[PDB]
């Protein structure tokens, strides 16, 4: 044990999630990301199937790590006196969706469809595993640029999925539903669907629809870019003011805008230029 196991490269990012470095597993030259989180910046703690005091983020990542490639998988973790260190898979080359949208602007609908579909599969996988992400947004999605595959990251604001009301939240406010803003109360699935509507709008328009609380509460969607009526309808459906008026995951994936999605590799070859 100990970081004789890993060679450390450049800082890849830092923010609310901690600090993430590029890394190489010395053992087999596996590319990895190395994420440092300060103990004092951790509020939510859980314990393992084993039963040790770990950050909730480790509990959640363990529950979603395995066969599916929709989430960036936890390979290992270490405790330090003042911090935890997490070793995560690193696709190469990779770009986060926020940066991809910054570089390219509003996405063509065919591309947004494939991207949005993969996000839905990823979020469904988390929920099936009993994990609520609570911070779905472009900054928390990585693109494996050669494979055309999207991967969910930073579960540091998430929770165990439950069927009762959540009264806490520490994700991104501008992706948070009106019921959180007004009442400080939400249910996990319908909150997630709201965040998915914001993300979808973000993809086809090149920015998020709401910046202020009053915009969120009003729920009035203005399309700033040319977007098909089918896409507008799905977006408007996801952004329903009443949580029960929002579509289920099945209803989203069965929507006419979602039909005939590109395969990931088709997506990379057409849009990411493989």
Ligand X SMILES: O=c1[nH]cnc2c1sc1c(Cl)ccc(Cl)c12
Q: How far is the CB of 89 from ligand X (least distance, A)?
A: 6
Select from 10, 37, 14, 13 the least CA-distant residue to 24: 10
Q: Tokens 């969607």 belong to which residue? A: 221
Name which of 142 and 196 has its Cβ closer to ligand X: 142
Name which of 90 and 113 has its Cβ closer to ligand X: 90
Phi and psi dihedrals of 194, rounded to 5? -50, -55
63 labelled as ligand-binding? no
Select from 227, 228, 270, 272 the least CA-distant residue to 106: 227
Q: How far is the CB of 17 from ligand X (least distance, A)?
A: 5
Cβ-contact 107, 227 below 8 angstroms = no
Is 135 tagged catalytic? yes
69 labelled as ligand-binding? no
Q: CB within 8 A of 242, min separation 6: which ones?
A: none
User: Interface residues with ligand X (CB under 6 A)?
Assistant: 12-13, 17, 20, 33, 35, 72, 88, 90, 94, 142, 153-154
Q: Alpha-carbon distance 18 to 85, whole Å?
A: 10
83 labelled as ligand-binding? no
Q: How far is the CB of 236 from ligand X (least distance, A)?
A: 31
- Among 135, 138, 144, 154, the active-site one is 135
Residues contributing to the annotated binding site:
12-20, 35, 89, 96
Residues contributing to the annotated binding site for ATP:
12-20, 35, 89, 96
């Amino acid at each position: 044990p100990l970081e004789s196991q890993y060679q450390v490269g450049p800082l890849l990012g830092s923010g609310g999630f901690g600090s993430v470095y590029s890394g190489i597993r010395v053992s087999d030259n596996l590319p990895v990301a190395i994420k440092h989180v300060e103990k004092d910046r951790i509020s939510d703690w859980g314990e393992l199937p084993n039963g040790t005091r770990v950050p909730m983020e480790v509990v959640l990542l363990k529950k979603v790590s395995s066969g599916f490639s929709g989430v960036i998988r936890l390979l290992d973790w270490f405790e330090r006196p003042d911090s935890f260190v997490l070793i995560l898979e690193r696709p190469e080359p990779v770009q986060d969706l926020f940066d991809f949208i910054t570089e390219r602007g509003a996405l063509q609908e065919e591309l947004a469809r494939s991207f949005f579909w993969q996000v839905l599969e990823a979020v469904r996988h988390c929920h099936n595993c009993g994990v609520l992400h609570r911070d779905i947004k472009d900054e928390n999605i990585l693109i494996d640029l050669n494979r055309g595959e999207l991967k969910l990251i930073d579960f540091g604001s998430g929770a165990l999925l439950k069927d009762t009301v959540y009264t806490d939240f520490d994700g991104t406010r501008v992706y948070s539903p009106p019921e959180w803003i007004r009442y400080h109360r939400y249910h996990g699935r319908s909150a997630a669907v709201w965040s998915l509507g914001i993300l979808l709008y973000d993809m086809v328009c090149g920015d998020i629809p709401f910046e202020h609380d009053e915009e969120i509460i009003r729920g009035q969607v203005f399309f700033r870019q040319r977007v098909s009526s089918e896409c507008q309808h799905l977006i408007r459906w996801c952004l329903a003011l009443r949580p029960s008026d929002r579509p289920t995951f099945e209803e989203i994936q069965n929507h006419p805008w979602m039909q005939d999605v590109l395969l990931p590799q088709e997506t990379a070859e057409i849009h990411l230029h493989s």
